[PDB]
Design a protein around this motif. Structure first.
Motif, PDB file in Angstrom:
ATOM      1  N   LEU A  59       0.815  -1.206   0.000  1.00 43.76           N
ATOM      2  CA  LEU A  59       0.000   0.000   0.000  1.00 43.76           C
ATOM      3  C   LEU A  59       0.857   1.269   0.000  1.00 43.76           C
ATOM      4  O   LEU A  59       0.516   2.273  -0.680  1.00 43.76           O
ATOM      5  N   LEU A  60       1.995   1.221   0.711  1.00 41.54           N
ATOM      6  CA  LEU A  60       2.953   2.358   0.650  1.00 41.54           C
ATOM      7  C   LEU A  60       3.591   2.523  -0.741  1.00 41.54           C
ATOM      8  O   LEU A  60       3.639   3.610  -1.268  1.00 41.54           O
ATOM      9  N   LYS A  61       4.092   1.448  -1.329  1.00 41.24           N
ATOM     10  CA  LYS A  61       4.643   1.550  -2.681  1.00 41.24           C
ATOM     11  C   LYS A  61       3.596   1.994  -3.702  1.00 41.24           C
ATOM     12  O   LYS A  61       3.864   2.866  -4.525  1.00 41.24           O
ATOM     13  N   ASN A  62       2.402   1.397  -3.680  1.00 46.23           N
ATOM     14  CA  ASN A  62       1.439   1.645  -4.767  1.00 46.23           C
ATOM     15  C   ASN A  62       0.436   2.771  -4.569  1.00 46.23           C
ATOM     16  O   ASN A  62       0.039   3.332  -5.561  1.00 46.23           O
ATOM     17  N   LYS A  63       0.016   3.087  -3.333  1.00 44.15           N
ATOM     18  CA  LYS A  63      -1.005   4.141  -3.125  1.00 44.15           C
ATOM     19  C   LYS A  63      -0.417   5.495  -2.714  1.00 44.15           C
ATOM     20  O   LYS A  63      -1.001   6.526  -3.003  1.00 44.15           O
ATOM     21  N   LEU A  64       0.697   5.494  -1.995  1.00 43.28           N
ATOM     22  CA  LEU A  64       1.360   6.748  -1.640  1.00 43.28           C
ATOM     23  C   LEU A  64       2.651   6.967  -2.449  1.00 43.28           C
ATOM     24  O   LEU A  64       3.235   8.062  -2.388  1.00 43.28           O
ATOM     25  N   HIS A  65       3.056   5.969  -3.249  1.00 45.59           N
ATOM     26  CA  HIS A  65       4.316   6.002  -4.029  1.00 45.59           C
ATOM     27  C   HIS A  65       5.512   6.350  -3.192  1.00 45.59           C
ATOM     28  O   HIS A  65       6.366   7.120  -3.616  1.00 45.59           O
ATOM     29  N   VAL A  66       5.571   5.760  -2.003  1.00 43.41           N
ATOM     30  CA  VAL A  66       6.751   5.862  -1.156  1.00 43.41           C
ATOM     31  C   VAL A  66       7.793   4.996  -1.865  1.00 43.41           C
ATOM     32  O   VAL A  66       7.467   3.948  -2.448  1.00 43.41           O
ATOM     33  N   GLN A  67       9.033   5.441  -1.833  1.00 42.39           N
ATOM     34  CA  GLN A  67      10.078   4.823  -2.637  1.00 42.39           C
ATOM     35  C   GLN A  67      10.605   3.531  -2.038  1.00 42.39           C
ATOM     36  O   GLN A  67      10.710   3.410  -0.825  1.00 42.39           O
ATOM     37  N   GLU A  68      11.013   2.630  -2.929  1.00 45.22           N
ATOM     38  CA  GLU A  68      11.233   1.221  -2.646  1.00 45.22           C
ATOM     39  C   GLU A  68      12.396   1.000  -1.687  1.00 45.22           C
ATOM     40  O   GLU A  68      12.350   0.089  -0.853  1.00 45.22           O
ATOM     41  N   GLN A  69      13.423   1.847  -1.809  1.00 47.67           N
ATOM     42  CA  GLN A  69      14.592   1.850  -0.911  1.00 47.67           C
ATOM     43  C   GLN A  69      14.263   2.122   0.562  1.00 47.67           C
ATOM     44  O   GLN A  69      15.014   1.706   1.430  1.00 47.67           O
ATOM     45  N   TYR A  70      13.164   2.821   0.839  1.00 48.42           N
ATOM     46  CA  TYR A  70      12.754   3.121   2.218  1.00 48.42           C
ATOM     47  C   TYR A  70      11.708   2.183   2.886  1.00 48.42           C
ATOM     48  O   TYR A  70      11.485   2.286   4.068  1.00 48.42           O
ATOM     49  N   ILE A  71      11.103   1.247   2.160  1.00 49.82           N
ATOM     50  CA  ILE A  71      10.064   0.395   2.734  1.00 49.82           C
ATOM     51  C   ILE A  71      10.765  -0.864   3.302  1.00 49.82           C
ATOM     52  O   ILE A  71      11.317  -1.639   2.538  1.00 49.82           O
ATOM     53  N   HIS A  72      10.795  -1.047   4.624  1.00 50.73           N
ATOM     54  CA  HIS A  72      11.323  -2.309   5.213  1.00 50.73           C
ATOM     55  C   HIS A  72      10.235  -3.291   5.678  1.00 50.73           C
ATOM     56  O   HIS A  72       9.805  -3.272   6.860  1.00 50.73           O
TER      57      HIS A  72
END
Ligand code: NI
Length: 341
Positions: A59-72
């Motif tokens: 949901l962070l990657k796809n709905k808020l477009h938070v960047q992949e390097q920061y999602i743990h």
């Protein structure tokens, strides 16, 4: 500025603390689940390490477009080391992706933050059962004994049976279902299963739902509204006007609407049983409001705190008034005296 009940003492850690900018002394921001009060502030310009569940990460990657390097993303029921500290993620029995978090502090103290949760006796056979909790950060949404509702299985029972009867009586009726957020997907997934249908929905809701690792999901939902007799609609459209208007779009396909509004608790539960719930009706359109809770009732909450036997409880919902705090502390002392801890 970040409130005290969102800080983990003795660590560089915060919990659902994204709307305050740069939290002084924070190295790893934790998110319990994807609900707007909790994630508020996150976006494609967030640049610190976020820790969460897999589903929450999607949901962070796809709905808020938070960047992949920061999602743990961290797996559940698993001991994991973050910035030198042992954490564990457990199911919150809330909405999808929703977790509680176990923190093992360097000085031997042990913290359970619950996120949002619907307490369950199954939580008494998780990794919590092995040991002591010194502090409990507790979802106190329904911490007053007048907050009674049915079990999720009773509500879904009633929704299936209702919907199958109306449509077997009238094969030309449409069933609509309300939503604003993730959670409560069983409402509409079970109605669509008893009825032979996929669920119809907008492009945005369909992509929200494609994030949630639900098995066989491509077989359950669609963007083709015309192919479907269960439809999803934003919660604010589930009113005589909103529906009238939707009934026109379908083009002399349907001649009746039965709509479900999933609510949380409402005062009517004090007097009436799930069994006895009756619609509002105008002409050919009917609306059921149904008490499908994803939060602990009072009775569930108390049971979980009495099994857990924490040393100290900090509430996280209803914190704003003197009368609400005073009420909640009075129930913590009765619970403790009664169980004897
Ligand atoms: Ni929530």
């Amino acid at each position: 500025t970040c409130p005290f009940y969102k800080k983990i003492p003795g660590t560089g850690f915060t919990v659902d603390a994204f709307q305050y900018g740069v939290v002084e002394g924070c190295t790893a921001y934790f998110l319990t689940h994807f609900h707007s009060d909790h994630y508020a502030g996150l976006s494609k310009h967030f640049t610190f390490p976020v820790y969460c569940s897999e589903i929450t990460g999607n949901l962070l990657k796809n709905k808020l477009h938070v960047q992949e390097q920061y999602i743990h993303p961290l797996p559940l029921d698993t001991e994991c080391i973050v910035n030198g500290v042992k954490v564990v993620l457990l199911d919150a029995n809330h909405c999808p992706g929703a977790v509680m978090i176990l923190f093992y502090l360097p000085n031997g103290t042990v913290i359970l933050h619950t996120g949002d949760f619907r307490a369950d006796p199954s939580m008494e056979r998780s990794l919590l059962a092995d040991q002591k909790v010194h502090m409990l950060y507790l979802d106190t949404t329904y911490c007053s004994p007048e907050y009674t509702f049915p079990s999720q299985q009773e509500v879904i029972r009633f929704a299936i049976n209702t919907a199958f009867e109306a449509v077997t009586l009238n094969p030309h009726a449409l069933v609509v279902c309300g939503t604003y957020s993730i959670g409560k997907e069983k409402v509409f997934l079970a109605i669509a299963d008893v009825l032979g249908s996929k669920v119809g929905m907008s492009q945005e809701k369909y992509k929200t739902l494609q994030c949630l690792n639900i098995p066989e999901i491509n077989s359950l939902i669609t963007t083709d509204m015309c192919s479907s007799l269960v439809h999803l609609l934003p919660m604010m459209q589930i009113n005589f006007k909103g529906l009238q208007s939707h009934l026109k779009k379908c083009g002399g396909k349907y001649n009746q609407i039965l709509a479900f509004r999933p609510t949380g608790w409402t005062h009517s539960n004090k007097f009436t049983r799930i069994a006895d719930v009756i619609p509002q009706t105008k002409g050919n359109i009917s609306i059921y409001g149904i008490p499908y809770s994803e939060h602990s009732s009072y009775l569930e909450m108390k049971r979980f705190v009495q099994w857990l036997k924490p040393q100290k409880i900090i509430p996280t919902v209803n914190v704003g008034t003197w009368k609400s705090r005073s009420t909640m502390e009075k129930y913590f002392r009765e619970w403790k005296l009664e169980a004897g801890y």
